[PDB]
Amino acid sequence: ARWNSKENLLAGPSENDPNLFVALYDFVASGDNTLSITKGEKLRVLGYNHNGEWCEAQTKNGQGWVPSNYITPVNSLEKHSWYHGPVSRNAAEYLLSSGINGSFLVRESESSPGQRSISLRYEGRVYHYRINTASDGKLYVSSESRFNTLAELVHHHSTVADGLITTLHYPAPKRNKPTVYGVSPNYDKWEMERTDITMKHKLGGGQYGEVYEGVWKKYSLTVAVKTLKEDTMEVEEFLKEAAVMKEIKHPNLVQLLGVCTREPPFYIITEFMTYGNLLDYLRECNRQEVNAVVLLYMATQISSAMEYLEKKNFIHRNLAARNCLVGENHLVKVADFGLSRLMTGDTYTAHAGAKFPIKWTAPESLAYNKFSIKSDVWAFGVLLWEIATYGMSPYPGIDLSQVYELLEKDYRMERPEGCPEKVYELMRACWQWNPSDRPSFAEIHQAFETMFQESSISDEVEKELG
Ligand SMILES: Cn1c(=O)c(-c2c(Cl)cccc2Cl)cc2cnc(Nc3cccc(CO)c3)nc21
């Protein structure tokens, strides 16, 4: 736990050549023309690939391609271990939910660009401070101590609290490397060699279909692999999923790594989420580690994924805790299998005779087999309840044959124990009988970010209990 570049905090912009870059995270080659780099390493950028997601760089070790958002200009604020860029208040509380006194970070508002804040951990609590800008541009927390640069402001408060609850001692660790959408900087290079993959045991006892844990030998990398059942040539369906996946690009949607569609058996290879589904995780987790701050963190990540699908005109229809996957640092990703393209202004009709997981299905879906992004919203509300109860089964003490009847009389699940009223009201909004009366995912995600801007969800939970 050290602050390496601390003795350089007060160094000038003019001491490094402007056009150079520095590595923000370690990157291990994922393709023959890709280049391995180490955090803190300097590089020279030669150019970008077709979508700007990758760039060709030169380091002392060689020349090659690396993820564009894995590096940053030498004089940018991003090089600082304590500048976490656009991070929300709640996310900040998560990043600082552990660590020694003095752990801190500086965050910006994606919402209101320019506005920055300092989040600090002291005696088990996180404190937030607005960084003000003077009429002449100087930054400050305490009106009597203004500085020209953010680094100088940070340096000052690492020497004396002067307004903060305590001093700035240790930049909080970054969550994790951003997601790389693929393994190659080149144009549509998804196809890979089937022999390069070692198939192992099936995942989730078959509840996800033909999905096996596997190993991409070349990179000593564990991956998930979905294969097509030959006993039923639904090839068109499977192939469609591969195509859709190639287009999906979001931090919280399971990422495609490659495919084997040249000849049978067809494969769809994705990243491996190491901790299984959110439902099992919630039920087996240590509730002291996975407290309210974490639940909110996870619920927020899931809404972000759905907001992305919402604007991309896709519907899910199987949104539930069991269809969410957990990775390192409580990272959650929604399983994007079975996605359907449906223009927001339009609805989908399932095949008569097809069964539905009743407890998560919206009224219009249970009665007319109709689905839309709004029925996904209804499902999210149920999933939110699963999160708030740490995995309980929905509608306790009620038989599936009465669910619809009860819903129709405006009955709804009770507020989970300790669940803050604000969160329960969001659930109720998702469970509005008319789909149009239900909030959009864009509105749901925003609701979470502005839900605890004054106190912490922990204190709220504390009041709901005692
Ligand atoms: C179950 N599952 C999938 O269906 C897909 C996937 C695939 Cl392979 C193709 C298309 C769409 C998706 Cl969502 C990806 C995926 C990635 N990681 C995991 N991890 C996982 C799930 C259950 C248990 C365990 C524990 O070993 C670990 N599970 C995954």
Residue 105 pairs with which residues in a beta bridge?
Answer: 119
Which residues, 6+ apart, have CB-to-CB distance to 42 below 8 Å? 20, 21, 22, 23, 59, 74
Q: How far is the CA of 299 from the centre of ligand 1 (A)?
A: 19
What is 273-466's CATH topology?
A: Transferase(Phosphotransferase); domain 1 (1.10.510)
Terminal Cα distance for the chain, rounded: 36
CA 149 to chain centre: 31
Please work out whether the CB of residue 272 comes within 6 Å of at least one atom of ligand 1. Answer: yes
Q: How far is the CA of 455 from the centre of ligand 1 (A)?
A: 36
Distance CA 56, CA 242 (A): 28
Which residues, 6+ apart, have CB-to-CB distance to 327 below 8 Å? 273, 274, 275, 333
Which residues, 6+ apart, have CB-to-CB distance to 88 below 8 Å? 107, 110, 300, 449
Count the neighbouring beta carbons within 10 Å of the beta carbon of residue 25. Answer: 17
Q: Residues preceding discontinuities in the chain at C–N > 2.5 Å?
A: none
Q: How far is the CA of 323 from the centre of ligand 1 (A)?
A: 9
Technique used by the depositors: X-ray
- The tokens of 360 are what? 């998560």
Q: Are 464 and 421 in contact (CB under 8 A)?
A: yes
Q: How far is the CA of 223 from the centre of ligand 1 (A)?
A: 8
Which residues, 6+ apart, have CB-to-CB distance to 27 below 8 Å? 34, 35, 36, 37, 66, 67, 70, 177
Q: What 3-state class would DSSP assign to 177?
A: coil
Q: How far is the CA of 360 from the centre of ligand 1 (A)?
A: 21
Amino acid residing at 70: Y
Q: Whose CA is nearest to atom 18 of ligand 1?
A: 273
Please work out whether the CB of residue 208 comes within 6 Å of at least one atom of ligand 1. Answer: yes
Distance CA 217, CA 206 (A): 24
Which of 158, 39, 170, 52 has the alpha carbon at shortest distance from 104? 170
Please work out whether the CB of residue 336 comes within 6 Å of at least one atom of ligand 1. Answer: yes
Q: Please report, for residues 251, 295, 421, the alpha-carbon distance to residue 292 in angstroms, rounded to integers and kept in the order given.
A: 22, 5, 14
Amino acid residing at 393: S
Please work out whether the CB of residue 228 comes within 6 Å of at least one atom of ligand 1. Answer: no
Please work out whether the CB of residue 276 comes within 6 Å of at least one atom of ligand 1. Answer: yes
Which of 159, 164, 79 has the alpha carbon at shortest distance from 118? 164
Please work out whether the CB of residue 270 comes within 6 Å of at least one atom of ligand 1. Answer: yes
Q: Whose CA is nearest to atom 23 of ligand 1?
A: 276
| Ligand 1 atom with least separation from CA of 335 | 13
Distance CA 158, CA 437 (A): 50
Q: What 3-state class would DSSP assign to 183?
A: coil
Resolution of this structure in Å: 2.3
CA 226 to chain centre: 22
Asked if domains 189-272 and 273-466 share a fold, the reply is: no
Please work out whether the CB of residue 296 comes within 6 Å of at least one atom of ligand 1. Answer: no
| Ligand 1 atom with least separation from CA of 254 | 13
Please work out whether the CB of residue 335 comes within 6 Å of at least one atom of ligand 1. Answer: yes
Which of 357, 383, 377 has the alpha carbon at shortest distance from 435? 377
Please work out whether the CB of residue 238 comes within 6 Å of at least one atom of ligand 1. Answer: no
Please work out whether the CB of residue 259 comes within 6 Å of at least one atom of ligand 1. Answer: no
Amino acid residing at 318: N
Q: Whose CA is nearest to atom 16 of ligand 1?
A: 272
CA triple 403-292-452, angle to 5 deg? 100
What is 1-78's CATH topology?
A: SH3 type barrels. (2.30.30)
| Ligand 1 atom with least separation from CA of 273 | 17
Q: How far is the CA of 361 from the centre of ligand 1 (A)?
A: 23
CA 275 to chain centre: 15
Q: Whose CA is nearest to atom 7 of ligand 1?
A: 226
CA 293 to chain centre: 15
| Ligand 1 atom with least separation from CA of 334 | 13
Which DSSP letter does residue 436 get?
Answer: G
CATH of segment(s) 189-272: 3.30.200.20
Domain positions in the chain are 1-78, 79-188, 189-272, 273-466
Please work out whether the CB of residue 300 comes within 6 Å of at least one atom of ligand 1. Answer: no
Please work out whether the CB of residue 248 comes within 6 Å of at least one atom of ligand 1. Answer: no
Q: How far is the CA of 304 from the centre of ligand 1 (A)?
A: 19
Please work out whether the CB of residue 203 comes within 6 Å of at least one atom of ligand 1. Answer: yes
CATH of segment(s) 79-188: 3.30.505.10
Distance CA 241, CA 224 (A): 15
Report CA torsion sign: 277, 283, 287, 289: negative
Q: Whose CA is nearest to atom 9 of ligand 1?
A: 226
Q: Whose CA is nearest to atom 13 of ligand 1?
A: 335
Q: Whose CA is nearest to atom 10 of ligand 1?
A: 337
Q: Are 171 and 39 in contact (CB under 8 A)?
A: no
